[PDB]
Design a protein around this ligand. Structure first.
Ligand code: HEM
Length: 323
């Protein structure tokens, strides 16, 4: 019975008999948060939602339903440690986005809001929902901000190892590669199912913490490649962020070997972020964010799914050669 954590592509609208039960169930969860209140409201919404699905083949969530969904999907994230304070999420509604250029601006706003000069704020930007599956909005990046990974003659790394495929893809799409250890990758944005466009991220928007010893690391951990599922609807483009734990900062840029044995700690990170006043999940933050979460108080659906890397499934039109 274990379920797949991946939700792949489609090439035709979700059939009605499949969509309705899911929509109906979401509307129930949504109105369920309200105990005995809003029963007539609940029924009026089902009628409206059903009417829409039967006439248009789909339906639109209300801003409040969307907000509830992004938070419930966060709450339902099994491995997420930050889900403990799921109410602390800022939602940016970009469901009326049409072009990659507009996606770029929305992402710039997201990065700008979330970074907040170091006082990290959790946010998610929701782009248009999947229609027929041929007009998907997708961010090809794994994260909004990430360093490039360059292959070396001897088989070693220079940059972030985890971005080898993507880094190469950027170069193939026209992007000019500098060969440093900390090159922020550009945004590869796909709008309405079209070929992706490359956009350099304005340097000012990228806040970095200085760890020669020789190291830096961006302050904003933002997942750009997941799919939000809610009531049968799928959102292939919905970048979100939180703040680092401190343990994980992928310094896989290494020969860094520079007790028992496996004693390479995560100390200078904990302190460097704190002294540069950038939110990290230390005890203070865990306690404070839980407090903020508690003050707001006064299969699994919705859910964040993984996807098949877009370059592996994209039906190229013509643009940018050596795809
Ligand atoms: C507030 C700060 C946050 C912290 C400290 C946090 C922490 C974590 C950690 C440690 C993981 C596991 C390792 C990894 O996959 O990177 C994780 C995974 C994940 N987080 Fe967060 N997170 C935060 C905010 C968010 C937000 C705002 C969302 C979405 C609205 C979210 C959604 C997820 C998802 C979907 C995963 C993938 C793994 C899974 O769900 O099982 N997180 N998070």
């Amino acid at each position: 019975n274990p379920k797949s954590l991946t939700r792949g592509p489609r090439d035709k609208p979700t059939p009605l008999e499949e969509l309705l039960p899911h929509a109906i169930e979401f509307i129930n969860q949504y109105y369920g948060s309200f105990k005995e209140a809003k029963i007539e409201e609940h029924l009026a919404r089902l009628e409206a939602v059903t009417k829409e699905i039967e006439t248009t083949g789909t339906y639109q969530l209300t801003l409040d339903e969307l907000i509830f969904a992004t938070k419930m999907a966060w709450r339902n994230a099994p491995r997420c440690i930050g889900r403990i304070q799921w109410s602390n999420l800022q939602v940016f509604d970009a469901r009326n986005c049409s072009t990659a250029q507009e996606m770029f601006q929305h992402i710039c706003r997201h990065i700008l809001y979330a970074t907040n000069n170091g006082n990290i704020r959790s946010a998610i930007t929701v782009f248009p929902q999947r229609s027929d599956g041929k007009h998907d909005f997708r961010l090809w990046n794994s994260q909004l901000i990430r360093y490039a990974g360059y292959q070396m003659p001897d088989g070693t790394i220079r940059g972030d190892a985890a971005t080898l495929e993507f880094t190469q893809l950027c170069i193939d799409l026209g992007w000019k590669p500098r060969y440093g250890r900390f090159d922020v990758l550009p945004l590869v944005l796909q709008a309405d199912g079209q070929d992706p466009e490359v956009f350099e991220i304005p340097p000012d928007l990228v806040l970095e913490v200085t760890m020669e010893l020789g190291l830096k690391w961006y302050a904003l951990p933002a997942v750009a490649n997941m799919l939000l599922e809610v009531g049968g609807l799928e959102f292939p483009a919905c970048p979100f962020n939180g703040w680092y734990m401190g343990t994980e900062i992928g310094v896989r840029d290494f020969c860094d070997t520079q007790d028992r044995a496996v004693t390479e700690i995560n100390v200078a990170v904990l302190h460097s972020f704190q002294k540069q006043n950038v939110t990290i999940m230390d005890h203070h933050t865990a306690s404070e964010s839980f407090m903020k979460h508690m003050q707001n108080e006064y299969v699994l659906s919705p859910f964040y799914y993984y996807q098949i890397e877009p370059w592996k499934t994209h039906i190229w039109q013509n643009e940018h050669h050596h795809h």
